Design an enzyme around this catalytic site. Structure first.
Site, PDB file in Angstrom:
ATOM      1  N   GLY E  29       0.797  -1.230   0.000  1.00  0.00           N
ATOM      2  CA  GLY E  29       0.000   0.000   0.000  1.00  0.00           C
ATOM      3  C   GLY E  29       0.826   1.275   0.000  1.00  0.00           C
ATOM      4  O   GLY E  29       2.052   1.229   0.112  1.00  0.00           O
ATOM      5  N   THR E  30       0.142   2.413  -0.116  1.00  0.00           N
ATOM      6  CA  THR E  30       0.801   3.726  -0.132  1.00  0.00           C
ATOM      7  C   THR E  30       1.329   4.077   1.257  1.00  0.00           C
ATOM      8  O   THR E  30       0.922   3.479   2.254  1.00  0.00           O
ATOM      9  CB  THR E  30      -0.147   4.857  -0.597  1.00  0.00           C
ATOM     10  N   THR E  31       2.230   5.053   1.316  1.00  0.00           N
ATOM     11  CA  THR E  31       2.865   5.433   2.574  1.00  0.00           C
ATOM     12  C   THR E  31       1.933   6.308   3.414  1.00  0.00           C
ATOM     13  O   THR E  31       1.306   7.235   2.900  1.00  0.00           O
ATOM     14  CB  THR E  31       4.195   6.178   2.334  1.00  0.00           C
ATOM     15  N   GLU E  46       0.149   9.561   1.603  1.00  0.00           N
ATOM     16  CA  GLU E  46       0.401   9.687   0.170  1.00  0.00           C
ATOM     17  C   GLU E  46      -0.789   9.131  -0.615  1.00  0.00           C
ATOM     18  O   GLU E  46      -1.202   7.992  -0.392  1.00  0.00           O
ATOM     19  CB  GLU E  46       1.685   8.923  -0.188  1.00  0.00           C
ATOM     20  N   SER E  74      -2.542   1.902   5.698  1.00  0.00           N
ATOM     21  CA  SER E  74      -1.968   1.478   4.426  1.00  0.00           C
ATOM     22  C   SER E  74      -2.317   0.018   4.180  1.00  0.00           C
ATOM     23  O   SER E  74      -2.315  -0.787   5.113  1.00  0.00           O
ATOM     24  CB  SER E  74      -0.451   1.646   4.449  1.00  0.00           C
TER      25      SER E  74
END
Ligand SMILES: [Cl-]
Ligand SMILES: [Mg+2]
Ligand SMILES: [Mg+2]
Ligand SMILES: [Mg+2]
Ligand SMILES: [Mg+2]
Lengths: 244, 241, 231, 195, 243, 250, 226, 196, 204
Positions: E29-31, E46, E74
């Site tokens: 996943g995204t940060t 993010e 995330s």
């Protein structure tokens, strides 16, 4: 999830057989032999205890012959613990019927009920079947003296003489040879003991390896008596019939 | 080989899921120790904060179950907190129903019974934790009772749990062989904590700062944990003789 | 492989294959386009027939006077989810005298789909949805995936060959967002967008399905000779 | 409904039941048969609250017919009466009890004996030479106590029954529009069409 | 083998492989990050711009629980929403019975026990998210991070997702260079920088920055989103640091 | 969640064996030896207190348990399974008997109830069998003194004397030579201690042996006086000192 | 019914009369109202006699199981808590009014219990229709630091007041003494001040006085052999 | 009953009579109506003794479980738990409870929960059958920030009058003082307070 | 309206030297109307005798219920139930219907087969046990029976003397009750013989 670990106890094989029923019958074929013989004046139940010990308290022991009510008894072949579950259910059904109609339950109705319970475990619920075969010896005023058997499939049939457990093929042939329709209880007692003596896997047939019972109208006038034989009484009937 | 996935018997009469739960017990790489005094019960445990981003005050494996009972856990924190919440609920319910504080040994039995059920029922997994319950019981005095994933429990004169339990166990055994008594013959709990830390240092062969340890103390009518500064005072006294 | 038997199993790389297989059903479905300006929001859908004797499967479902969606994938699953949206729009109106916000409708669809991805016995939904609506914050367009992921967009397309229409909208972004107060020109842009996904077949009078909702325009569906004007 | 009588003689059981059905102000019917055949040699008459009477009687009938088919055997009158008693004893502690009183007349083919059982809505069972429900017994029992013999013929039983009905028609305030009379013996159940 | 095919099964190591596979979804996943400041907490995430057709500022990721707790996660976004829905129920029942808003440590255990319960049976799947959450209660500011196993601890700073290693290093510098502490406004600026720096692991597509905060002095202990001028100021500060 | 294991985990194999029951019996075979002997005026049950650690207080772990004032139980196999069975057995003695008839159940019927519980863990959905064999000794007015064995299958048998677990085969042979129908209780205790010494490796004293009797009524253990018909429990656990006294006359 | 409880130096004593009534009729002249919850926890009951006996045996049964589970001798506070919560649940419909007394490892205790769930603590208590007569004696003669002999005397005197003055009470005095570190001693018919005098006449009839229609042997034996 | 709780400079004090009644018969003349639900959170009970004992036992259980998880509960939290039980079971309960407690942050606080199950935070509260007779006296004599000795006198005098006029009230005056210093029990006998 | 006096009837039991006696009337009625003179109220399960007064449907129901339960008892226990044990079973069974009770007044009588000790007991409709040494009474003429028994009874009466005492107690009590009479039965019970005697009495 959980499907992974399911044995699926209630399915048909490609040949149209119920796996678990067949395997339960295989279990029962190793149990001690039980015999039932029906005569004109009564019924005999004889059964062999499985390889015992000298330190087993026999006079307080019961593994084969059970009382369902005053008129009906059963011989067991298979898992004793499974049998006691069903026996207690049968005892309750008999009392339910007596309370409802104020008459003792006819033998076949009790047999059909227990057999239907066995059937249910083969069609639904996903549980293992009961590893038990019964011989029912009983009396009612409709059909008189009756012998039935039931097995894990829930199928039941009526008999003049029948065996369950070990060596039934050999036992049934011996019974088919010597059984006659005009036979009496004292003759049937001798036949049952002679058949067990020949089919047993033990070296000799002694009192401590047997359970014995008779259902007679040999009760003072028009009534029926159940006699679960004591160890000394099994010893005496073995001497009388000339086996020991 | 599905007898290894759920809690059913193997051909040797073994329960592999239970055995593997015992192995999860050492996943945290932490050792704990418990001893009894005249008036108190002390439990110590190693504290390791490997990340600088962590808030060290929230990192703990000692739990205050009730006012009188404390519990240290050997195993992963999720299962530890699961057991902690349940033990707290059980202790509170006991007091409500029966009108007196749940004894340490009785709570241990109850949690052990719950653990036994997970070893017999297939849908529930065992918890990968060993639970050490401590108190000063009003009838039995200082008490240590320890539970495991098999559902086994027993009382202890003293005990140890973790990867290096055997070293600590033998060290404690040797001391009680000398003294020939079932406890630490000391008046104050401060000196019993000092005994506990000293004998852990001896057994493990490592020195401890104030942030390397975690201490719980049970006295009559209360269980409490020590702060870093309370432990520091304990460490200073050990070094000065 | 060994980890696609049910929805309750992660793969060693952390994937949920049953959900990914459900996503594949959408890609087999017929193309549908969604786009909006500041005054209106439009759905355009290419309907699919079984053969020349058969009807063309309907693609657009009305959920309320101010909201509706178009589908791509398992149609019965769209019926279940659209029924749920109808109920939730309805609960909001009856209990709170409030038209259900399009963004909140997306959140509800996400949570309903999620429960079918974390439990044994069940299965994921096998359909993708494009929800348009006009509420108190203007026109809206949403994209729903049966993984649970719901996204708010200016324009998009789902189904087979949807990538052609999605690129066209990405080029035209600055033009069609400005088409305010002109419903016909916004539909023209949507019909031109869905045309970038056609091969061998073209838009006929029983092939095309259009829906529109806006400032003073209830959610209405156009089929038959009502779309001949745009062919 | 109203009057139901029963008498057990040497070789049969006779049940007499009124024909009137009254909806408060008007007599809606004067030919109602307040009885159900439970089995070829067992008859049950009934009286109590409207609706519940027929509903209970037909429910019992269905159950005994089901038993007969399952076992290919007719239950004894004693067994049927016990089943009925249990149903009423169960009913009395229900949410809404069956307000029904019954007489069960049967010929036991095994013992070759007629049998009459009286059961009220509470589940109170008694075997009797003669019985009734409601106020019927208050008028008729003094005549039955005097004339009844255990060795009476069926014809003598019908004559004693006529004397009972005549006393009812004289001293009862309600017009019950006569009675339908049925006989239960070794040959089964038959209706006396002139009474 | 086969120990990894079913949830709640111990391997011969004493490991739950299904939980370890859930962590892989989190790492994909995204940060997202969290910073504990002097009198509160800051959250940032993010958001990958997959296409020009995404409406800017509309697809909001950070979620509020009650009025004093923020949550960001995330991994699988739907799983995170499910966890927050439960958290909102837990916080509601606590406030219903006890009147006071749920303390952050109390709220942490509620999520923890719920996530841990999804490791006890094979009829359920573990959560495919790591959740960073926290806020202000009567005892001050608290920041927590919760893993698929149910494990959670308190943090000075926290990070998860694809760019977690980069973020963690940046957070560790802030802890060392500020033992006295960080202000709420400083923490917003620093959060913007750390997300911009962590975006190197996701450099293919451009992104959208989203920040929120709870501070005793700046937001009265309530959770609020950073918007307009204060957001642009943080974006400018971040863009200046990467150049 | 929900228990989705509604199916049997014990099933018949092609040979007619119930695998899980056989494996449970194997677990019992690995367990520490326990025995029982019946005398004319009493019954004795005994086992070894195999302490897991010398730091453990083995007095806090009870292998011999009181079920009713006149009935006691000992086991071989899995300890935790035994503990929960003792809890269930104590409760069922009340719920299915004492709360109905106002008296404690006879030995044979309590055994029957415990057997039923063990049978159901062999057929019910989503459970394994119990991994223990029990020896239950007791007295009641009409049946006198009795001793029963209960297995994982739910089967039970009455014994004059027997042994279960580790060294049961050798122990049963030892008991066959010594047992007669004229034994007094003290003679049976003596034989029990002789038999148990053979299967014990290490220390053999009152602290490592757990032994209890079903014998005479103990009015001193009743806790109250004033009711002539209440004469006290027949179950008594022997002390560490009482065992050691009989180890000198050994 | 008259029942009392009195604390003393090293324990507690409870007492009760032995009359049970149906309206104005005496059903039993020598009734036992002192119930055992556990060996050293006894209670006396007033109100609906089946309820006081049923609720005592239920809680007594559960107390025995609790004692076995915990390996501890039962406590009076446990019996109290279990009794009150059971009775509160049934909103007074279970008409049990109890005085609960006993000794345990915590010490000696005395409580009473109303049918609706309320409990109280005291050194001396009385319950039942004769409670006002009994309480009058207790309020007149009770002091702190009573001996065992003094407490038995005071308790039985309080029951006597109920016996003689309350029509709901009569016949004999039953006592139970629970002292710390000792067996509880149940003293059934501790006082017997109401023996009936010899009658003026014997009412034994000559044999054959009653007219008989039929005689027959009743078969109580089971179906016989042969 | 005559019960009251009064906040003062150093914390809060609870007061109560000791008379329990079934009609005109005093079933207990030495009752303890001041009940502990937590170390420094107590309550005064009025109404059905069965109902108020059942409620107080449940609250003590709830706060014991709260403490094990979240630490010491506030007085507001304790009042809320009382309210939840009294409001949701209003049809089946007859209970009037005054909750009093001492925090270090909030100091002395008093909450009264009448029959309906409503909550009211007050500087002081009075309840029970005997309270009707002292509304006038208490309103005229209560001051905020009194000393310990002044508050003991205020409660002693107030309950003295309540006992004097209300037949349902009587016996000894019990009091419980809640401050930072700890928990102190006081008792005042008839020969003392009757001559006031 | 009152369920316990719709049908009428009485039972009485007494102890003697090595014997017990139990007796009952034979009436069943519907308030004023006499319905049956053959309604026996004493039943036996083995050597234990049970008399039941009160609502007749419940009398029949309970007899069927205790026959049911004692039959299962015998099958499991392998012995006949004793008077002391059966008394507890009656009490248990009645109390389980605490808030919807059987409207009855049961009476137990018998000799313990092992100790030889004579035993009697009585109950209220909800299970409370009255275990008297001398006598137990029940039914719509229980007041009258209390008066007869209290004066006529003396301890240690021989079986044939006890018969006269209990018979005269029942007969004269029943004649002062409108809802009792229409015949009577007396059981004389010794350790291994039981005699049943029907008494001649007025039929009004
Ligand atoms: Cl438990
Ligand atoms: Mg498991
Ligand atoms: Mg006054
Ligand atoms: Mg009369
Ligand atoms: Mg008359």
């Amino acid at each position: 999830g959980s499907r992974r670990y399911d044995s699926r106890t209630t399915i048909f094989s490609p040949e149209g057989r119920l796996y678990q029923v067949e395997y339960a019958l295989e279990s029962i074929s190793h149990a001690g032999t039980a015999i039932g013989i029906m005569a004109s004046d009564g019924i005999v139940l004889a059964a062999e205890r499985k390889v015992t010990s000298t330190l087993l308290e026999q006079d307080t022991s019961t593994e084969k012959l059970y009382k369902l009510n005053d008129k009906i008894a059963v011989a067991v072949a298979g898992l004793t613990a499974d049998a006691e579950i069903l026996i207690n259910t049968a005892r309750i059904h008999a009392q339910n019927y007596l309370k409802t109609y104020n008459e003792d339950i006819p033998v076949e109705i009790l047999v059909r009920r227990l057999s239907d319970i066995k059937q249910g475990y083969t069609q639904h619920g996903g549980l293992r079947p009961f590893g038990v075969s019964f011989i029912y010896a009983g009396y009612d005023d409709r059909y008189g003296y009756q012998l039935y058997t039931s097995n894990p499939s829930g199928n039941y049939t009526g008999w003049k003489a029948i065996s369950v457990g070990a060596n039934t093929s050999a036992a049934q042939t011996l019974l088919q040879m010597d059984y006659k329709d005009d036979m009496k209880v004292d003759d049937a007692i001798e036949l049952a003991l002679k058949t067990l003596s020949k089919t047993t896997d033990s070296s000799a047939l002694t009192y401590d390896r047997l359970e014995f019972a008779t259902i007679r109208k040999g009760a003072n006038d028009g009534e029926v008596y159940q006699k679960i034989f004591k160890p000394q009484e099994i010893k005496d009937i073995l001497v009388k019939t000339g086996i020991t | 080989g599905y007898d290894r996935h759920i809690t059913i018997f193997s051909p040797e009469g073994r329960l592999y899921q239970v055995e593997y739960a015992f192995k999860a017990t050492n996943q945290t790489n932490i050792n704990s120790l418990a001893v009894r005094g005249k008036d108190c019960t002390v439990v110590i445990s190693q504290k390791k904060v490997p990340d600088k981003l962590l808030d060290p005050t929230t990192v703990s494996y000692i739990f205050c179950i009730s006012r009188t009972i404390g519990m240290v856990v050997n195993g992963p924190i999720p299962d530890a907190r699961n057991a902690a919440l349940r033990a707290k609920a059980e202790a509170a319910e006991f007091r409500y129903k029966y009108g007196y504080d749940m004894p340490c040994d009785v709570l241990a039995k109850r949690m052990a019974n719950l653990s036994q059920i997970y070893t017999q029922r297939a849908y529930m997994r065992p918890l990968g934790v060993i639970l050490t319950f401590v108190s000063v019981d009003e009838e039995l005095g200082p008490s240590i009772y320890k539970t495991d994933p098999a559902g086994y429990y027993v009382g202890y004169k003293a005990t140890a749990t973790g990867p290096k339990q055997q070293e600590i166990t033998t060290n404690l055994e040797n001391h009680f062989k000398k003294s020939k008594i079932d406890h630490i013959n000391e008046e104050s709990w401060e000196k019993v904590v000092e005994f506990a830390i000293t004998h852990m240092i001896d057994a493990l062969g490592t020195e401890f700062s104030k942030n390397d340890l975690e201490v719980g103390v049970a006295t009559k009518d209360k269980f409490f944990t020590l702060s870093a500064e309370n432990i520091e005072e304990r460490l200073v006294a050990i070094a000065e003789q | 492989n060994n980890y696609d038997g049910d929805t309750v199993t992660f793969s060693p790389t952390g994937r949920l294959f049953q959900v990914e297989y459900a996503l594949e059903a959408i890609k087999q479905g017929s193309v549908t386009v969604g786009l909006r300006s500041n005054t209106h929001a439009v759905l355009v859908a290419l309907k699919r027939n079984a053969d020349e004797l058969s009807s063309y499967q309907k693609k657009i479902i009305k959920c309320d006077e101010h909201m509706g969606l178009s589908l791509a994938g398992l149609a019965p699953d769209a019926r279940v989810l659209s029924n749920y949206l109808r109920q939730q729009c309805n609960y909001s109106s009856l209990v709170f005298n409030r038209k259900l916000a399009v963004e909140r409708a997306g959140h509800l669809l996400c949570d309903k789909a999620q429960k079918n991805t974390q439990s044994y016995g069940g299965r994921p939904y096998g359909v993708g949805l494009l929800i348009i609506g006009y509420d108190k914050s203007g026109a809206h367009l949403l994209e729903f995936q049966p993984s649970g992921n719901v996204t708010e967009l200016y324009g998009t397309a789902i189904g087979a060959r949807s990538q052609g229409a999605k690129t066209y909208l990405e080029r035209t972004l600055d033009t069609f967002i400005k088409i305010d107060g002109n419903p016909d020109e916004l539909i023209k842009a949507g019909v031109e967008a869905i045309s970038q996904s056609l091969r061998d077949e073209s838009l006929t009078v029983d092939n095309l399905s259009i829906a529109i909702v806006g400032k003073d325009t209830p959610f209405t569906i156009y089929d038959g000779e009502a779309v001949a004007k745009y062919i | 409904m109203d009057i139901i009588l029963g008498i057990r003689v040497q070789d049969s059981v006779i049940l007499a039941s009124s024909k009137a059905v009254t909806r408060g102000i008007s007599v809606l019917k004067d030919s109602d048969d307040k009885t159900r055949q439970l089995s070829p040699h067992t008859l049950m008459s009934f009286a109590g609250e409207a609706g519940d009477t027929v509903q209970f009687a037909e429910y019992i009938q269905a159950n005994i017919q089901l038993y007969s088919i399952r076992e290919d055997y007719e239950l004894s009158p004693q067994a049927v009466s016990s089943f009925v008693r249990q149903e009423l004893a169960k009913s009395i502690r229900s949410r809404r009890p069956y307000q029904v009183n019954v007489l069960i007349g049967g010929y036991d083919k095994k013992k070759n004996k007629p049998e009459l059982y009286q059961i009220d809505y509470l589940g109170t069972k008694v075997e009797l030479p003669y019985g009734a429900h409601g106020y019927s017994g208050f008028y008729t029992f003094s005549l039955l106590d005097h004339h009844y013999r255990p060795d009476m013929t069926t014809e003598e039983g019908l004559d004693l029954l006529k004397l009972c009905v005549q006393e009812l028609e004289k001293r009862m305030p309600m017009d019950f529009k006569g009675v339908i009379v049925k006989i239960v013996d070794k040959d089964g159940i038959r209706q006396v069409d002139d009474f | 083998t086969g120990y990894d095919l079913s949830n709640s099964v111990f391997s011969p190591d004493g490991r739950n492989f299904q939980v370890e596979y859930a962590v892989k979804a989190v790492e994909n996943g995204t940060t997202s990050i969290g910073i504990k400041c002097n009198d509160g907490v800051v959250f940032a995430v993010e958001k990958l711009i997959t296409s020009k057709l995404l409406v800017p500022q509309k697809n909001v990721k950070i979620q509020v629980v009650d009025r004093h707790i923020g949550c960001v996660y995330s991994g699988l976004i739907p799983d995170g929403r499910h966890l927050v829905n439960r958290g909102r129920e837990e916080a509601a029942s606590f406030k219903k019975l006890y009147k006071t808003p749920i303390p952050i440590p109390a709220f942490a255990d509620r999520l923890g026990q719920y996530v841990q319960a999804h490791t006890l049976y094979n009829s359920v799947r573990p959560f495919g998210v790591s959740t960073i959450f926290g806020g202000v209660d009567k005892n001050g500011a608290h920041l927590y991070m919760l893993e698929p196993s149910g494990s959670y601890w308190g943090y000075k700073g926290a990070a998860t997702g694809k760019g977690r290693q980069s973020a963690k290093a940046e957070l560790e510098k802030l802890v060392d260079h500020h033992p006295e502490g960080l202000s709420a406004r400083e923490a917003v600026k620093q959060a913007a920088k750390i997300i911009y720096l962590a975006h190197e692991d996701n450099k293919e597509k451009d992104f959208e920055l989203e920040i929120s905060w709870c501070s005793l002095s700046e937001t009265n202990g309530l959770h609020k989103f950073v918007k307009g001028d204060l957001l642009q100021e943080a974006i400018d500060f971040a863009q200046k640091e990467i150049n | 969640m929900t228990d989705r294991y509604s199916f049997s985990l014990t099933t018949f194999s092609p040979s007619g064996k119930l695998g899980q029951i056989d494996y449970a019996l194997t677990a019992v075979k690995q367990g520490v030896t326990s025995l029982g002997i019946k005398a004319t005026n009493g019954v004795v049950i005994a086992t070894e207190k195999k302490s897991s650690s010398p730091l453990a207080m083995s007095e806090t772990l009870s292998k011999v348990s009181l079920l009713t004032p006149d009935i006691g139980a000992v086991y071989s196999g899995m300890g935790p399974d035994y503990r929960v069975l003792v809890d269930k057995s104590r409760k069922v003695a009340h719920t299915s008997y004492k709360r109905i008839y106002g008296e404690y159940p006879p030995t044979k019927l309590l055994v029957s109830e415990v057997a039923k519980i063990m049978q159901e863990a062999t057929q019910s959905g989503g459970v394994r069998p119990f991994g223990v064999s029990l020896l239950i000794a007791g007295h009641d007015e009409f049946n006198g003194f009795s001793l029963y064995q209960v297995d994982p299958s739910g089967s039970y048998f009455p014994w004059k004397a027997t042994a279960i677990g580790k060294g049961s085969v050798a122990a049963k042979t030892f008991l066959e030579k010594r047992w007669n129908d004229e034994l007094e209780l003290e003679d049976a205790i003596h034989i029990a201690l002789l038999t148990l010494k053979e299967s014990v490796e290490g220390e053999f004293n009152g602290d490592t042996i757990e032994l209890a009797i079903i014998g005479d009524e103990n009015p001193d253990l009743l806790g109250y006086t004033g009711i002539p018909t209440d004469k006290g429990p027949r179950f008594r656990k022997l002390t560490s000192q009482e065992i050691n006294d009989r180890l000198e006359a050994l | 019914t008259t029942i009392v409880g009195v604390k003393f130096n090293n324990g507690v004593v409870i007492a009760a009369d032995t009359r049970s009534t149906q309206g104005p009729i005496v059903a039993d002249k020598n009734c036992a109202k002192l119930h055992r919850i556990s060996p050293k926890i006894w209670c006396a009951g007033a109100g609906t006699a089946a309820d006081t006996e049923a609720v005592t045996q239920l809680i007594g049964s559960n107390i025995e199981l609790h004692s076995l589970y915990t390996s501890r001798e039962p406590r009076v506070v446990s019996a109290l808590q279990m009794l009150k919560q059971h009775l509160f649940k049934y909103q007074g419909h279970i008409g049990a009014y109890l005085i609960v007394a006993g000794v345990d490892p915590t010490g000696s205790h005395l409580f009473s219990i109303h049918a609706e769930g309320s409990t109280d603590v005291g050194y001396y208590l009385s319950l039942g229709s004769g409670s006002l007569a009994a309480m009058a004696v207790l309020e007149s003669h009770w002091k702190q630091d009573l001996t065992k002999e003094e407490a038995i005397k005071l308790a039985s005197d309080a029951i006597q007041a109920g016996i003689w003055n309350d029509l709901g009470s009569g016949s004999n005095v039953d006592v139970c003494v629970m002292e710390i570190g000792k067996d509880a001693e149940y003293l059934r018919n501790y006082l017997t001040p109401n023996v009936r005098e010899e009658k003026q006449k014997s009412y034994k009839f000559p044999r054959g006085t009653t007219a008989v229609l039929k005689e027959s042997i009743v078969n109580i034996c089971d179906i016989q052999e042969e | 009953t005559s019960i009251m709780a009064v906040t003062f400079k150093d914390g809060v004090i609870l007061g109560a009579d000791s008379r329990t009644t079934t009609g005109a018969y005093i079933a207990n003349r030495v009752t303890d109506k001041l009940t502990r639900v937590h170390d420094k959170i107590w309550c005064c009970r009025s109404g059905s003794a069965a109902d108020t004992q059942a409620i107080a036992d449940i609250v003590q259980y709830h706060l014991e479980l709260y403490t094990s998880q979240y630490g010491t509960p506030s007085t507001e939290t304790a009042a809320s738990v009382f309210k939840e039980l009294c409001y949701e079971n209003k049809d089946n309960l007859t209970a009037g409870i005054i909750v009093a407690g001492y925090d270090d942050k909030n100091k002395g606080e008093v909450y009264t929960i009448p029959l309906g199950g409503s909550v009211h935070k007050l500087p002081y509260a009075i309840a029970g059958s005997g309270s009707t007779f002292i509304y006038g006296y208490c309103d005229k004599n209560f001051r905020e920030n009194m000393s310990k000795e002044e508050t003991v006198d205020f409660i002693k005098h107030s309950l003295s009058q309540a006992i004097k006029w209300d037949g349902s009230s009587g016996g000894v005056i019990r009091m419980v003082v809640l401050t930072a210093a700890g928990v102190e029990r006081l008792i005042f006998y008839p020969d003392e307070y009757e001559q006031l | 309206s009152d369920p316990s006096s719709i049908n009428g009837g009485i039972v009485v039991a007494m102890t003697g030297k090595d014997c017990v006696a139990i007796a009952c009337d034979l009436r069943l009625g519907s308030q004023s109307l006499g319905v049956s003179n053959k309604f026996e109220k004493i039943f036996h399960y083995g050597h234990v005798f049970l008399g039941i007064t009160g609502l007749a449907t419940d009398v029949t129901t309970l007899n069927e219920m205790f026959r049911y339960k004692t039959n299962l008892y015998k099958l499991k226990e392998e012995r006949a139930i004793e008077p002391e044990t059966f008394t507890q079973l009656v009490s248990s069974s009645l109390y389980e219907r605490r808030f919807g009770p059987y409207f009855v007044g049961p009476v137990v009588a018998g000799i313990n087969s092992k100790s030889g000790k004579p035993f009697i007991a009585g109950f209220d409709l909800i299970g409370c046990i009255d275990e008297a040494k001398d006598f137990i009474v029940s039914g719509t003429a229980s007041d009258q029976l209390f008066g007869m028994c209290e004066s006529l009874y003396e301890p240690n009466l021989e079986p044939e003397d006890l018969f006269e005492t209990i018979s005269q107690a029942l007969l004269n009590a029943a004649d002062r009750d409108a809802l009792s009479g229409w015949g009577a039965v007396v059981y004389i019970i010794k350790k291994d013989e039981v005699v049943k005697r029907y008494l001649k009495m007025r039929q009004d």
